[PDB]
């Protein structure tokens, strides 16, 4: 029934064709040769940065179900990258250029009940339309919505919490109802607020009069006593079930996930639930490396989990709306989010960027973003742009900023607007920074003090920071890869130590958002900016951040200990403990106290309190680091060993049990070890993979930016000792999935993944 169903998946059973072909929108077109696949789908991750432009066609053929007779029928696309045209039974019903905002088509008038129907989508992504890897295809989920003629249209519930206290929160709810009948009506609304255990704990009644053919809105509120407060440690989520009634008859059911938290900002900082919050933040691009751009919940969850292990409490969605699923995870995992709309406005950064669409589409797209995301408790700011060229239009650039900021204020005043500024002092002197609620600075720690003198009333944070580059496990002593000593970057870049320093000296700054948390795909086809590599393996940079951003005692040592006798090895230790002591084959090499024994790093040079360092003449064997508190008590330790020749493969699944849904993944780390089980720190052995039983091979990676190996062939070379196998369940198939990893001259490895549900 249409009254109980709130939008089901329309992802299954499509036809795809990469390339231009005449008349493929037509009912009678013959797509029998076309490849068969389920959405979501990124075609650009398959081919051989990686080519992302051209033409792609999708067609789905379906019977008009008898239950859809006299119903309103819509197809929702969360994302199609990019330049979409859509047809139903040959009639054009949709056209959407921007690939990061979703859109909806109404197929009610053209739907044929009991006969065949053909939904056709053409994507024409252009070259030079993105500064990073966008993907190509219907890369986000697609939804079928079958409603009765009185119903809640898309983004039709808006949930706010204008009072949030320990004793009582007030939940305010705006309901939008569409009356597609030929009669005026008064309709009842029942809001059921449902807790984490599935029990309805409060019901709020409302109603609305809507004339025939029209849409109406109504507002009501309800008290929640002793509420479960959404916070970073305890990210408690409620579920709102909204039911529409026409007299005794239910006409529609509509669900909204929401949380209960208050946010507040002054010129001196940001506040969550009445407490100062600081952003230990990361920028992330939307791809998931070997998995490409197609939405995958587990891929995103893993990425966010790894970021939380680093001490990350905040995300900047550089530089576009993310998927809804990504934001659902942030909600569930207690991360605060800066939800960013655009990378350029009226002035072009790239030839076929958003400036082509800005005048016609900017209001519609920003409106669509805020309407889509204004119920996520994770979202705390609307970022209207990143590094936009209008920063240097002295006379008029501020007007475009105001225009976008006013739309933020009109649609959702419960969250501040912001923007990421890379020019200095331009947008501060040109009246631009003042048009948003909170100003973000990109790569300007040296100017933090000065901008506060000149513009003391602006709230501030580092919207983009560091841009330090490294390759995982690569050290250049004394290139095509970059040193993992974390010194090098582009002209505006600087090591993390510099941001930490200037964050401490400028407490008003709300925090930072590093470029980037994970490596991402480009247009060397991928990045080096990530603290974690493209397949989810932490670089040494991860531990530098972890040492600064977490309390749980840790210690990490670099580099590896496969060197030549005679070399002097600079040895760096990152810890959150008071001091550390280095031991080479049992012999002490000295204590070093953090904040006292400083490490000089080249930028001219900086004395950093954030690294501990030794100069060690290389004798082979084992190098052990011990971290202590200020009483001398051992709190953590790590040991690294000079490894021998590659002898064996070890396989480490992140999860030995996965869901039998056809989408869920196990990420199996692949190690190249010597005879004693020590990792071979520079190994590049080709590993081959075989997957049998309940599931299949999905993808491989190694975090190497400068390779052309496929992400989707069952073979991959190690990089700096490791690579990564990704397997996936088959839908509704339980049991064992058996993996075998082989490599010429090494001991074969096996592991089993169990698949349930
Ligand atoms: O260091 C490179 C970064 C500069 N800021 C904008 C990002 O998208 C990226 O290009």
Kindly state the tokens that stand for 739. 């993996």
369: helix, strand or coil: helix
DSSP 182-203: SS-EEEEEEEEEE-TTS-EEEE
Q: Does residue 339 have its Cβ closer than 6 Å to ligand 1?
A: no
Kindly state the tokens that stand for 7. 């939008």
Strands (E), 550-695: 555-558, 568-575, 579-584, 587-593, 599-602, 605-608, 612-617, 622-628, 634-641, 648-653, 657-659, 665-673, 686-693
Q: Are the beta carbons of 563 and 618 closer than 8 angstroms?
A: yes
Distance (Å) of CA 584 to CA 484, 588, 642: 22, 7, 11
Q: Does residue 343 have its Cβ closer than 6 Å to ligand 1?
A: no
d(CA 673, CA 650): 7
d(CA 261, CA 166): 10
To test the pocket of ligand 1, the residue of 467, 470, 519, 521 to mutate (highest count of ligand atoms within 8 Å of its CB) is 467
Residue 666 dihedral angles phi and psi, to the nearest 5°: -110, 130
Mark which of 128, 148, 168 sits at the end of a domain.
148
Q: Does residue 533 have its Cβ closer than 6 Å to ligand 1?
A: no
- Which residues are CB-contacts of 39 (< 8 A; sequence separation ≥ 6)? 11, 14, 58, 138, 141, 142, 294
d(CA 573, CA 558): 7
Question: What angle (nearest 5°) sits at the alpha carbon of residue 42, between those of residues 37 and 47?
Answer: 95
To test the pocket of ligand 1, the residue of 383, 495, 515, 517 to mutate (highest count of ligand atoms within 8 Å of its CB) is 515
What is the position in ligand 1's atom list of the atom closest to the CA of 467?
A: 1
Residue 355 dihedral angles phi and psi, to the nearest 5°: -50, -25
Question: What CATH code is carried by the domain that includes residue 431?
Answer: 3.20.20.80
Distance between start and end Cα atoms, the chain: 26
Strands (E), 259-378: 263-266, 269-272, 275-277, 279-283, 314-316, 336-340
Q: Does residue 469 have its Cβ closer than 6 Å to ligand 1?
A: no
Q: Are the beta carbons of 290 and 699 closer than 8 angstroms?
A: yes
Question: What angle (nearest 5°) sits at the alpha carbon of residue 578, between those of residues 576 and 583?
Answer: 90
Q: Does residue 387 have its Cβ closer than 6 Å to ligand 1?
A: yes
166 in the same domain as 79: no
d(CA 80, CA 127): 16
Minimal-distance CA residue to ligand 1 atom 2: 467
Q: Are the beta carbons of 2 and 146 closer than 8 angstroms?
A: yes
- Which residues are CB-contacts of 198 (< 8 A; sequence separation ≥ 6)? none
d(CA 720, CA 683): 6
Distance (Å) of CA 177 to CA 154, 198, 242: 10, 26, 11
Q: Are the beta carbons of 565 and 618 closer than 8 angstroms?
A: yes
H-only helix segments in 225-357: 297-309, 324-333
Question: What CATH code is carried by the domain that includes residue 754?
Answer: 2.60.40.10
621 in the same domain as 501: no
207 in the same domain as 93: no
Residue 377 Cα to ligand 1 midpoint, Å, equals 27
d(CA 415, CA 404): 14
Residue 283 Cα to ligand 1 midpoint, Å, equals 10
Query: Which of these is catalytic: 344, 464, 499, 512?
Result: 464
- Which residues are CB-contacts of 61 (< 8 A; sequence separation ≥ 6)? 15, 31, 116, 117, 118
Question: What CATH code is carried by the domain that includes residue 90?
Answer: 2.60.120.260
Residue 432 Cα to ligand 1 midpoint, Å, equals 20
d(CA 254, CA 273): 28
Kindly state the tokens that stand for 201. 């704990």
**Is 464 designated active site?**
yes
Cα 726 to the center of its chain, rounded Å: 19
Method: X-ray
367 in the same domain as 356: yes
Helix (H) or strand (E) holding 408: helix 397-411
DSSP character at residue 594: T
DSSP 201-247: EEEEEEEEEE-TT-EEEEEEEEEEES---B-SSSB--EEEEEEEEET
DSSP character at residue 567: P
**Structure-token match 């004693």, residue found:** 676
Considering only CA atoms, which of 500, 516, 486 is closest in space to residue 445? Answer: 500
d(CA 611, CA 487): 12
85 in the same domain as 187: no
- Which residues are CB-contacts of 479 (< 8 A; sequence separation ≥ 6)? none
Number of domains in the chain: 5
637 in the same domain as 743: no
To test the pocket of ligand 1, the residue of 387, 388, 419 to mutate (highest count of ligand atoms within 8 Å of its CB) is 387
529 in the same domain as 397: yes
Peptide bond into 434 cis (omega under 30): no
Helix (H) or strand (E) holding 371: helix 358-373
Kindly state the tokens that stand for 97. 């250029």
660 in the same domain as 550: no
Mark which of 262, 286, 306 sits at the end of a domain.
262
Query: Which of these is catalytic: 387, 499, 579, 581?
Result: 387
137 in the same domain as 47: yes
Strand partners, 280: 512
d(CA 548, CA 538): 15
319-355 burial, b for 16+ CB within 10 Å, e for fewer? bbbbbbbbbbbbbbbbbbbbbbbbbbbbbebeebbbb
187 in the same domain as 100: no
Domain ranges, residue 713: 647-757
210 in the same domain as 88: no
Kindly state the tokens that stand for 95. 């056209």
577 in the same domain as 564: yes
Residue 516 Cα to ligand 1 midpoint, Å, equals 9
What is the position in ligand 1's atom list of the atom closest to the CA of 442?
A: 5
What is the position in ligand 1's atom list of the atom closest to the CA of 492?
A: 1
Q: Does residue 114 have its Cβ closer than 6 Å to ligand 1?
A: no
d(CA 338, CA 342): 12
- Breaks in the chain follow which residues, C to N over 2.5 Å? 48, 478, 523, 603
Q: Are the beta carbons of 186 and 136 closer than 8 angstroms?
A: no
435: helix, strand or coil: helix
- Our separate counts of H helices and E strands in the chain read 8, 47
Residue 299 dihedral angles phi and psi, to the nearest 5°: -55, -50
Mark which of 554, 577, 607 sits at the end of a domain.
554
């Amino acid at each position: 029934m249409a009254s109980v169903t709130d939008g089901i998946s329309f992802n299954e059973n499509w036809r795809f064709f990469k390339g231009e072909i005449k008349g493929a929108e037509a009912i009678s077109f013959d797509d029998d040769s076309w490849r068969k696949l389920n959405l979501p789908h990124d075609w650009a991750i398959e081919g051989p940065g990686l080519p992302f432009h051209g033409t792609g066609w999708y067609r789905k053929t379906f019977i008009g179900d008898a239950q859809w007779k006299d119903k309103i029928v819509r197809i929702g696309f969360d994302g199609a990258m990019s330049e979409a045209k859509v047809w139903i039974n040959g009639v054009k019903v949709g056209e959407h250029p921007y690939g990061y905002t979703g859109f909806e088509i109404d197929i009610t008038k053209y739907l044929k009940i009991g006969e065949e129907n053909v939904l056709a989508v053409q994507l024409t992504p252009r070259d030079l339309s993105s500064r990073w890897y966008p993907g190509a295809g219907i890369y986000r989920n697609v939804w079928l919505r079958v409603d009765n003629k009185v119903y809640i249209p898309e983004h039709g519930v808006y949930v706010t919490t204008p009072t949030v206290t320990k004793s009582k929160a007030v939940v305010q709810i705006e309901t939008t109802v569409k009356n597609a009948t030929f009669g005026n009506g008064k309709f009842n609304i029942r809001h059921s607020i449902i807790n984490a255990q599935g029990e309805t704990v409060a019901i709020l009644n409302d109603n609305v009069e809507v004339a025939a053919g029209e849409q109406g809105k109504t507002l009501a509120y309800i008290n929640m006593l002793n509420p479960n407060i959404w916070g970073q440690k305890n990210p408690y989520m409620y579920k709102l079930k909204t039911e529409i009634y026409d007299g005794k008859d239910l006409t529609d059911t509509y669900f909204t996930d929401f949380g209960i938290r208050k946010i507040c900002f002054t010129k001196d900082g940001f506040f969550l639930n009445g407490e100062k919050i600081r952003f230990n933040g990361v920028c992330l691009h939307h791809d998931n490396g070997p998995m490409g751009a197609a939405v995958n919940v587990r891929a995103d969850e893993r990425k966010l989990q790894i970021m939380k292990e680093m001490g990350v409490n905040a995300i900047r969605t550089s530089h576009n709306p993310p998927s809804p699923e990504f934001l659902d995870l942030c909600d569930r995992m207690g991360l605060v989010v800066l939800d960013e709309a655009f990378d350029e406005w009226t002035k072009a950064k790239v030839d076929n960027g958003y400036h082509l669409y800005f005048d016609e589409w900017s209001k519609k797209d920003l409106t669509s973003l805020i309407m889509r995301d204004r119920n996520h408790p994770s979202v705390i700011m609307w970022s209207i742009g990143n590094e936009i060229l209008e920063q240097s239009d002295k006379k008029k650039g501020f007007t475009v900023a105001k225009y976008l900021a006013d739309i933020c204020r009109e649609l959702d005043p419960t969250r501040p607007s912001t923007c990421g500024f890379n020019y200095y002092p331009a947008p501060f002197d040109n009246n631009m920074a003042q048009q948003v609620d909170i100003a973000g600075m990109n790569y300007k720690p040296g100017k933090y003090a000065e901008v506060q003198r000149l513009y003391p009333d602006l709230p501030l944070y580092g919207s983009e920071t560091s841009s330090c580059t490294s390759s995982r496990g690569v050290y250049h002593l004394p290139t095509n890869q970059v040193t993992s000593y974390d010194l090098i970057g582009p002209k505006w870049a600087y090591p993390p130590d510099i941001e930490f320093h200037f964050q401490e000296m400028n407490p008003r700054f709300m925090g930072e958002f590093i470029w980037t948390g994970f490596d991402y795909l480009g247009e060397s086809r991928s990045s080096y900016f990530g603290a974690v590599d493209l397949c989810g393996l932490p670089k040494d940079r991860f531990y530098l951040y972890q040492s600064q951003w977490t309390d749980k005692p840790m210690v990490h040592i670099l580099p590896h200990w496969n060197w030549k006798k005679g070399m002097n090895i600079p040895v760096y230790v990152y810890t959150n403990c008071y001091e550390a002591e280095l031991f080479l084959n049992g012999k002490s090499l000295g204590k070093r106290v953090k904040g006292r024994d400083l490490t000089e790093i080249m930028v001219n040079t900086f004395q950093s309190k954030y690294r501990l360092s030794w100069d060690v003449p290389f004798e082979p064997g084992e190098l052990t680091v011990k971290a202590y508190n200020n009483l001398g008590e051992l709190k953590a330790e790590k040991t690294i060993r000079t490894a021998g020749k590659p002898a064996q493969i070890k396989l480490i699944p992140d999860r030995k049990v996965i869901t039998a849904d056809g989408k869920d993944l196990s990420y199996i780390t692949v190690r190249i070890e010597d005879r004693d089980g020590n990792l071979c720190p520079e190994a590049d052995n080709l590993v081959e993979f075989s997957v049998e039983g309940a599931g299949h091979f999905r993808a491989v990676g190694n975090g190497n930016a400068a390779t052309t190996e496929s992400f989707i062939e069952p073979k991959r070379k190690a990089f700096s000792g490791m690579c990564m196998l990704i397997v996936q369940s088959d839908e509704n198939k339980q049991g064992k999935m058996n993996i075998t990893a082989t490599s010429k001259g090494l001991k074969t490895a096996k592991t089993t993944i169990n698949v349930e549900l």
